[PDB]
Amino acid sequence: CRXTPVC
């Protein structure tokens, strides 16, 4: 999942 480099 993008929008987050950690998810």
Side-chain angles (χ1 to χ4, degrees):
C1 21
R2 210 92 88 202
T4 159
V6 58
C7 219

